[PDB]
Scaffold this active site. Structure first.
Site, mmCIF file in Angstrom:
data_model
loop_
_atom_site.group_PDB
_atom_site.id
_atom_site.type_symbol
_atom_site.label_atom_id
_atom_site.label_comp_id
_atom_site.label_asym_id
_atom_site.label_seq_id
_atom_site.Cartn_x
_atom_site.Cartn_y
_atom_site.Cartn_z
ATOM 1 C CE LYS A 18 34.101 34.452 48.520
ATOM 2 N NZ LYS A 18 34.826 33.226 48.111
ATOM 3 C CB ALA A 88 43.266 54.567 44.266
ATOM 4 C CG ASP A 131 42.900 38.275 42.630
ATOM 5 O OD1 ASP A 131 42.251 37.845 41.677
ATOM 6 O OD2 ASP A 131 42.364 38.733 43.621
ATOM 7 C CD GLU A 135 37.070 42.096 41.159
ATOM 8 O OE1 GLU A 135 36.267 41.888 40.224
ATOM 9 O OE2 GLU A 135 37.146 41.355 42.166
#
Ligand code: ATP
Ligand code: MG
Ligand code: MG
Length: 265
Positions: A18, A88, A131, A135
């Site tokens: 976002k 990652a 959260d 994703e």
């Protein structure tokens, strides 16, 4: 530790969020590969999310666990804030699920064990993530799960809300209802993930926000025939409306379906 944009060579985009625009980068002197999460100050200021960014940096920088993504530092200039993260290399669990459609019991149980271990470490410091969604689960060089994106993390207990119009699919009833909550929030998200890994879609998915909200608050989900008895038992224990009835992470790690299917050690 005194870093600036001129200390790095930027590469390809790793993903978008976002606010987070994340790039591969290399530190010029050491040649060390890392990721830079770039945030625009004007957008952070318009949304009023500066306190969340402070918690992300302060909480994540002090955690040291092989299943938690490291945050090494940060820096800023006139228009952007840069978070220096561990890179990652095998991407997100979100992309793995899009490629494979659904996971087998061994891969699911292994990812749930790794989460469980990361969350057990967080919860030992009263840190709650809030959260946990595919994703935000990244994969290390050995395919090991790493929890990332600590923007909504806080010290338990908390009453602070998460998104306003974003995805409700991983949030428990007490968070969607605005009630006080604690570590049990991450146990609910663990059950949602376990279901999504095996089935290919989260259990309360619907075409509208209100219908998803209704399904979560009433805990309305059903299993396809192929989901086994042991997986049904674990998922059913985690997705309990009453948070006090959700298991401890040690009970998830010793559940007979987890010990029978996970890759160890
Ligand atoms: N260290 C990393 N290595 C590889 N990919 C990453 C890394 N960090 C982030 N990404 C990718 O970039 C995207 C953005 O990550 P992140 O969740 O940090 O942004 P965000 O969701 O905007 O953060 P926040 O939720 O705090 O606003 C993710 O989809 C993720 O796949
Ligand atoms: Mg994210
Ligand atoms: Mg953020």
């Amino acid at each position: 530790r005194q870093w600036a944009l001129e200390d790095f060579e930027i590469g390809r985009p790793l993903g978008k969020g976002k606010f987070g625009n994340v790039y591969l980068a290399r530190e010029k002197q050491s040649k060390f590969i890392l990721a830079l999460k770039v945030l625009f100050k004007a957008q952070l200021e318009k949304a009023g999310v500066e306190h969340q960014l402070r918690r992300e940096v302060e909480i994540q920088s002090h955690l040291r666990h092989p299943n938690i993504l490291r945050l090494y530092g940060y820096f800023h200039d006139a228009t952007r804030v840069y978070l220096i993260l561990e890179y990652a290399p095998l991407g997100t669990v979100y992309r793995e699920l899009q490629k494979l459609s659904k996971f087998d019991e061994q891969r699911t149980a292994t990812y749930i064990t790794e989460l469980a271990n990361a969350l057990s470490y967080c919860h030992s410091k009263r840190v709650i993530h809030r959260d946990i969604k595919p994703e935000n689960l990244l994969l290390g060089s050995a395919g090991e799960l790493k929890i990332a994106d600590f923007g909504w993390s806080v010290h338990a207990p908390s009453s602070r809300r998460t998104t306003l119009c974003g995805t409700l699919d991983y949030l428990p009833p007490e968070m969607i209802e605005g009630r006080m909550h604690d570590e049990k929030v991450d146990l609910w998200s663990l059950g949602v993930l376990c279901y999504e890994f095996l089935v290919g879609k989260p259990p309360f998915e619907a075409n509208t926000y209100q219908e998803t909200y209704k399904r979560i608050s009433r805990v309305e989900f059903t299993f396809p025939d192929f989901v086994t008895e042991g997986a049904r038992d674990l998922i059913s224990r985690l997705l309990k409306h009453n948070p006090s009835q959700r298991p401890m992470l040690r009970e998830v790690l010793e559940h007979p379906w987890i010990t029978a299917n996970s890759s160890k050690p």
